[PDB]
């Protein structure tokens, strides 16, 4: 995608950095700012697995302080927001290791 604020798309799921609009095809999806940031990170760092520690650093930063399970909490809310189109299946748990976003499922 040779464009910075360009719309990211994967398996029918699109995310607009400018308007913060996320869609399963043409149906709009609802999620908070943390989930959006998490989804944005996943769609741009696909297939690879990340520990909660890595996801905390990439998404929450450092000037805040959050526990690892908080990641699990927002992973849940994100999956929940992605259900309409079944895209929640793209947010996958890597047993006792972390999470990955995949087109394969």
């Amino acid at each position: 995608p040779m464009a910075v604020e360009e719309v990211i798309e994967m398996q029918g799921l699109s995310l607009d950095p400018t308007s913060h609009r996320v869609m399963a095809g043409e149906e709009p999806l609802e999620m908070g700012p943390t989930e959006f940031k998490l989804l944005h990170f996943f769609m741009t760092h696909p297939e690879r697995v990340y520990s909660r520690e890595q996801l905390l650093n990439h998404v929450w930063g450092t000037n805040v302080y959050v526990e690892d399970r908080t990641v699990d909490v927002h992973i849940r809310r994100l999956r929940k927001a992605l259900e309409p189109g079944g895209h929640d299946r793209m947010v996958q748990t890597v047993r006792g290791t972390g999470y990955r976003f995949s087109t394969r499922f």
Side-chain angles (χ1 to χ4, degrees), residues 44-62:
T44 52
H45 295 76
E47 307 303 317
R48 170 176 303 290
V49 60
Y50 294 85
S51 52
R52 290 172 176 64
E53 173 177 353
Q54 300 173 294
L55 292 171
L56 284 182
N57 291 311
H58 269 91
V59 178
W60 286 256
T62 189

Side-chain angles (χ1 to χ4, degrees), residues 7-102:
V7 179
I8 306 72
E9 192 281 355
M10 296 183 71
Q11 230 61 182
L13 186 72
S14 61
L15 181 152
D16 187 354
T18 308
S19 66
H20 282 215
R21 183 144 40 201
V22 178
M23 305 188 105
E26 281 184 291
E27 276 302 318
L29 301 177
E30 278 302 303
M31 68 185 84
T34 303
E35 292 71 29
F36 183 84
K37 201 177 312 304
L38 222 203
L39 178 60
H40 189 192
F41 165 84
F42 275 134
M43 294 179 85
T44 52
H45 295 76
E47 307 303 317
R48 170 176 303 290
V49 60
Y50 294 85
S51 52
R52 290 172 176 64
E53 173 177 353
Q54 300 173 294
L55 292 171
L56 284 182
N57 291 311
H58 269 91
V59 178
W60 286 256
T62 189
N63 57 61
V64 180
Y65 127 98
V66 164
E67 47 280 69
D68 284 15
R69 245 59 192 177
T70 288
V71 178
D72 305 48
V73 172
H74 294 287
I75 281 294
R76 187 198 308 116
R77 298 176 185 175
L78 174 60
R79 279 168 171 162
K80 204 298 183 177
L82 301 175
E83 297 182 302
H87 295 91
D88 53 296
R89 260 98 52 58
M90 298 180 89
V91 181
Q92 322 181 330
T93 313
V94 179
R95 196 168 184 175
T97 295
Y99 300 90
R100 68 184 180 227
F101 189 82
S102 179

